[PDB]
Write a protein that binds this DNA or RNA. Structure first.
Ligand SMILES: [Mg+2]
Ligand SMILES: [Mg+2]
Ligand SMILES: [Mg+2]
Ligand SMILES: [Mg+2]
Ligand SMILES: [Mg+2]
Ligand SMILES: [Mg+2]
Ligand SMILES: [Mg+2]
Ligand SMILES: [Mg+2]
Ligand SMILES: [Mg+2]
Lengths: 139, 25, 81, 220, 183
RNA sequence: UCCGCCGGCACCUUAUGAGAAAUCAAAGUCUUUGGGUUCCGGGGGGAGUAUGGUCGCAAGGCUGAAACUUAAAGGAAUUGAC
RNA sequence: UGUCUGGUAAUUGGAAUGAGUACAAUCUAAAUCCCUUAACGAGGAUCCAUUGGAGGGCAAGUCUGGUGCCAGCAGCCGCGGUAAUUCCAGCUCCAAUAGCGUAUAUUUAAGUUGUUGCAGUUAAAAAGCUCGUAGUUGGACCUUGGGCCGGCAUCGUUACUUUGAAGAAAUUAGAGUGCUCAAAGCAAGCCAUCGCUCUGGAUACAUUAGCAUGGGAUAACAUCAUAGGAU
């Protein structure tokens, strides 16, 4: 089984160093690929609303999720961001200024929405929550 | 699908890829 | 077991097997207890007896008979027979 | 109301006992649930879970509710009952009966000092039920119970005040979790400490020293 | 460099691991109710302080008796407890301090002592009176209900000289009423 | 033919053992965790695939990813249905 | 039946007070904040508490109205197809409370990185098999009876263990100290002084490596019969 010699510290250390790589989280963090994602290791990002789209919810659900195809200004990547809080697709217009955030599962699709990992947090410098509750008006 | 025949399909794909790569070097 | 005053603190003191010394649990239903009566020089039962307890483990082993026989041979020496 | 059907109950009913530690002392097979009613003064009962299990028949699925009950005053006595019945009421009642029938004594020791009212298990004790292994380790006077909800309830009913617990295996399985906890609570009285190994003296069993009233005074 | 950066600073409460438990919620609400607190933080900080003290005592009890790094701080801890009215004169051992509990601490608060000294109609009236600058410990005005009193100062709590309840001029309400009745 | 010893391939009964169980006299002596040592696994796919290195006449062998996708895949046993 | 206890009312009363305002003094290099304080200052005491939720995990509704696999909610399981405990709202209730929600990173949870402490017949995982250097690991044997209780050499080497020294402060642990409490600070305290307590401003830990003292049990090296040995 294990090497229990008192003189075998190097063997145990090297074996653990080799075997840490099978870990999903450790390999995710120490491979450096997290910098090639659209956010490039950032909590939020900013973007321009390229277009407004809808995606059919995955089975067995049946609905149309009002997403938005936007383009990040920091690297130019094009991503789809969810728009929650029904009626909040109306606030978003064309080529508009939005603040995007992750969806919650750390680079994983959330819910029945196929392949969406971002949600719109702000539009034109105003939070979607304030507009939804009529606390603020779009400028 | 039987994994034996999947392995055979993979081998055919590998040899075809090798031929295609040898075509253009 | 013993408090700083010097009194009992556990509910009871268990029995331990007279062959393997392992204690007898309150839910050990294979553990038994035998009283072997003693006789007089004529061969009359005098009303006193020697008590042995065997745990379920030693019984289920099958060494209960040998252990009890050895215990009786050893014990009868002090109290004659 | 109650007509004893076994020697132990017939012995108890008139009042030839005070506590139930002498029954434990001879490891007698308690089989009537009124014995623990009469002997143990305080009993508290909380049901732990009501799990519906199913058996698929040709017509449909026959469902039966299995109930878990924990019994015992918080002064060293605890028991566990499991009963599966057609509907929840009889399941709960039968599980209460079984739990009262399965009361065992627990040993409470000290952590490092013998200031009165012992509050902890005496040793490191473990219990395995299928896959769920539970371990309790002695804790100082002010620690409290460090455990999940199920072992916490079992230990509170057992009378333990402070302990350090661990767990391994699928503890989501309530039956195995609680059975392992209760089983190792039984083991708490099983370790041979250096104080216990004073030579034992023997006492007549209740079946043997009450022979006078057990030959043929059937029920009078 | 900014010298003000060198001032140490810390936190005093911890918050519980499991937020939604019925028995714990009822226990905490029970304690808050008759100890006249404001939120679960006023009790969580008491739990935090008690946990620190208990951890220190448990660490001390793990050492050998003849260890000076046991004797010195054992004496110090027992001195502090006997000074704050927590441990009785019959509990002079390191084992008794492990048995301390939160209500022992909450019994020594200034609001609790004011209520139990008969000066307040209820433990909420005590807190209201404390926060309104009506209570002085020794000679010093105190308006902090969490003020933990010591045994030597337990015999000096009294309404302040400036207080109308301790021999002061009438408050603005009574003076306004006298002004109204003057004409 | 009978008895005994050492070595080997197995077999039968039984746990007081272990195990998720089937079962195992070793797959036991494990939360009461430590005899020595080698190799090797980290949810299911992508995939033993891409590429580099290297051995081979070739077929191929050894070493061997990533993006992306997914909430199950799987083991043992149970009751029905077929 | 009785009296007391306890709880609710945009009911009735009185008292209390600081948020605010402001003479004034104090603070300050000068101002300002704080502390102190004239005068004013609360009844729906409008001097109006918020953030998230109410199927499970997880504390709190199978209330009412709207929608009808649509709009949407939903971290996961899932909800909505004319009776929605899950969506849109009202009422009510729950948790925290001057704080709460959301996203990333990572600590715990994770005994799912396992030295402590995981696994490998069937769940993923023993190399087809053997040999083999480095590495790791290696049987037993050699002081016990013995009681008592300034010199002066020249020497097997280490690991281990004890004791000591040197060891930056800050941070951490920790003694004292009533900043009104606390987080803090290293201050202060007292007869009621032409002052005193020499006032205090402790103490630990700080891997490994290095220096020195004692111990020789357990371990590693070569030393072991051409006497080229000791005296
Ligand atoms: Mg995998
Ligand atoms: Mg609602
Ligand atoms: Mg609930
Ligand atoms: Mg409805
Ligand atoms: Mg594992
Ligand atoms: Mg398979
Ligand atoms: Mg396999
Ligand atoms: Mg093999
Ligand atoms: Mg050796």
């Amino acid at each position: 089984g294990k090497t229990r010699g008192m003189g075998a510290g190097r063997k145990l250390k090297t074996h653990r160093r080799n075997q840490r790589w099978a870990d999903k989280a450790y390999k995710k963090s120490h491979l450096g690929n997290e910098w090639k994602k659209p956010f490039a290791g950032s909590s939020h990002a900013k973007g321009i609303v390229l277009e407004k789209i809808g995606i059919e919810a995955k089975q067995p659900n049946s609905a149309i999720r009002k997403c938005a195809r936007v383009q990040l200004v920091k690297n130019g990547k094009k991503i789809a961001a969810f728009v929650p809080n029904d009626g909040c697709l109306n606030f978003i217009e064309e080529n508009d200024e939005v603040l995007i955030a992750g969806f919650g599962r750390k680079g994983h699709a959330v819910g029945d929405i196929p392949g969406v990992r971002f949600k719109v947090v702000k539009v034109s410098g105003v939070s979607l929550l304030a507009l939804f509750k009529e606390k603020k008006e779009k400028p | 699908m039987r994994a034996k025949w999947k392995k055979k399909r993979m081998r055919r794909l590998k040899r075809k890829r090798r031929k295609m790569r040898q075509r253009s070097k | 077991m013993q408090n700083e005053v010097g009194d009992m603190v556990d509910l009871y003191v268990p029995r331990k097997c007279s062959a393997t010394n392992r204690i007898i649990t309150a839910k050990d239903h294979a553990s038994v207890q035998i009283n072997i009566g003693h006789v007089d020089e004529n061969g009359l039962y005098d009303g006193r007896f020697t008590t042995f307890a065997l745990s379920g483990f030693v019984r289920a082993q099958g060494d209960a008979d040998g252990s009890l026989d050895r215990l009786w041979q050893k014990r009868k020496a002090e109290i004659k027979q | 109301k109650w007509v004893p059907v076994t020697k132990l109950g017939r012995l108890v009913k008139e009042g030839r006992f005070t506590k139930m530690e002498e029954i434990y002392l001879h490891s007698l097979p308690v089989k009537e649930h009124q014995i623990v009613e009469t002997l143990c003064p305080g009993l508290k009962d909380e049901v732990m879970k009501i799990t519906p299990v199913q058996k698929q028949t040709r017509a449909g699925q026959r469902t039966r509710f299995k109930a878990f009950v924990v019994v015992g005053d918080s002064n060293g006595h605890v028991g566990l009952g499991v009963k599966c019945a057609k509907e929840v009421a009889t399941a709960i009642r039968g599980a209460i009966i079984l739990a009262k029938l399965s009361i065992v004594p627990v040993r409470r020791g000290y952590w490092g000092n013998k200031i009165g009212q012992p509050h902890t298990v005496p040793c490191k004790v473990t219990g395995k039920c299928g896959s769920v292994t539970v371990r309790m380790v002695p804790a100082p006077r002010g620690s409290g119970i460090v455990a999940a909800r199920v072992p916490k309830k079992v230990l509170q009913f057992a009378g333990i005040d402070d302990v350090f617990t661990s767990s391994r295996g699928s503890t989501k399985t309530l039956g195995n979790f609680v059975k392992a906890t209760f089983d190792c609570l039984m083991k708490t009285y099983g370790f041979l400490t250096p104080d216990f190994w004073r030579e034992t003296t023997f006492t007549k069993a209740p079946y043997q020293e009450f022979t006078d009233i057990l030959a043929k005074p059937t029920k009078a | 460099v900014h010298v003000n950066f060198y001032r140490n600073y810390g936190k005093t409460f911890k918050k519980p691991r499991r937020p939604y438990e019925k028995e714990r919620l009822d226990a905490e609400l029970k304690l808050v109710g008759e100890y006249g607190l404001r939120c679960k933080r006023e009790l969580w900080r008491v739990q935090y302080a008690l946990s620190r003290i208990r951890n220190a005592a448990r660490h001390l009890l793990t050492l050998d008796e003849k260890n000076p790094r046991r004797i010195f701080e054992g004496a110090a801890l027992l001195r502090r407890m006997n000074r704050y009215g927590l441990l009785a004169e019959g509990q002079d051992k390191l084992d008794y301090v492990l048995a301390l509990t939160a209500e022992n601490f909450l019994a020594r608060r200034l609001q609790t002592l004011v209520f139990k000294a008969g000066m307040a109609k209820s433990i909420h009236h005590a807190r209201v009176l404390i926060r309104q600058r009506h209570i002085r410990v020794g000679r010093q005005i105190v308006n902090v209900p969490s003020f933990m009193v010591r045994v030597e100062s337990e015999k000096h709590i009294d309404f302040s000289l400036t207080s109308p309840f301790g021999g002061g001029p009438a408050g603005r309400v009574k003076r306004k009423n006298q002004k109204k009745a003057s004409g």
